[PDB]
Amino acid sequence: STGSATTTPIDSLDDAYITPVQIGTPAQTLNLDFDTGSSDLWVFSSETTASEVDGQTIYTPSKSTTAKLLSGATWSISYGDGSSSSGDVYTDTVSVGGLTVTGQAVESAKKVSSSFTEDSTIDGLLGLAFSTLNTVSPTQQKTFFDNAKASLDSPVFTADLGYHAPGTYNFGFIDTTAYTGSITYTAVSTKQGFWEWTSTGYAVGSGTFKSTSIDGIADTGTTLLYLPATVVSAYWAQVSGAKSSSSVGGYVFPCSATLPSFTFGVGSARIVIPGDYIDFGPISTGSSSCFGGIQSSAGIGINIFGDVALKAAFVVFNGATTPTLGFASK
């Protein structure tokens, strides 16, 4: 089997991407944030505290003839931006882009933090990291991809995120028309539950490539590119007027600037992030200070190749017995 679904930015800055997902019988379609950095499929639901729902589409298990309470199971998750959610669990039929999994754990939110409430466009998350991170207790549950894997034509999914445009998530096949040149594959460590890999270095603009190992994760659920302070300083030093602002919470730059590109290494291959991808616009409406898309990972504890990086590439998440990651230009 295979599946193919379009993923669409939630706003004009590509702050996140939503992908329609069919849950239950008859189908209830929710727009979920596919997140290769976590491993819970959770949704706004008929159980979510009413004051914490503000425009989201909700899953109502009592209206699904295939929904079953997973008795005794609960979940609770916190993310790197300090957001959180928690609740109980149903199993139900879940389809993405024509690919159907029966008996998928669908985690129903009883509580969500303010940032989720405040984002009316995201109806929940669909985790695509390794199932070892799944938070369901006392019986840990599998991700949609893990459940689907054995039925897929090939045990892979691909992320093809657009810059200010829709893109695609494919399951079970590699669309050889969706990228240019060849795909360079690189080793993955699953020790922390992530799609963790090591970039071979970076360049800023037309500058020389610096060979250096940068361990990080391929995370579709994180907006920006978070890298070591040394690397980030070298990038922003090429932008007149750019500075790190503790009050804003990162690097900002004059909105009048033309940003240089940023290149990262994948083995001997190179992925180029155009400068425009690194512009996240005014820090507040009408401001002439703009927020940077490359930020320091110091104090996160991990480097994160988020959407800013991933959207510059066609990315293969290879879930074979020894997982790997592939990157191609596009």
UniProtKB/Swiss-Prot annotation:
Reactions accelerated catalytically: Hydrolysis of proteins with specificity similar to that of pepsin A, prefers hydrophobic residues at P1 and P1', but does not cleave 14-Ala-|-Leu-15 in the B chain of insulin or Z-Glu-Tyr. Clots milk
Catalytic residues (positions): D35, S199
One Gene Ontology biological process: proteolysis
Keywords: Aspartyl protease, Disulfide bond, Hydrolase, Protease, Signal, Zymogen
EC class name: hydrolase
EC number: 3.4.23.22
Keyword Signal attributed: yes
The keyword Disulfide bond appears for this protein: yes
GO MF terms held by the record: aspartic-type endopeptidase activity
Coiled-coil annotated residue ranges, if any: none
Disulfide bridge positions per record: C255-C290
Chain ranges of the Peptidase A1 domain: 17-328
Entry similarity comment: Belongs to the peptidase A1 family.
Protein name, entry field: Endothiapepsin
Organism the protein comes from: Cryphonectria parasitica
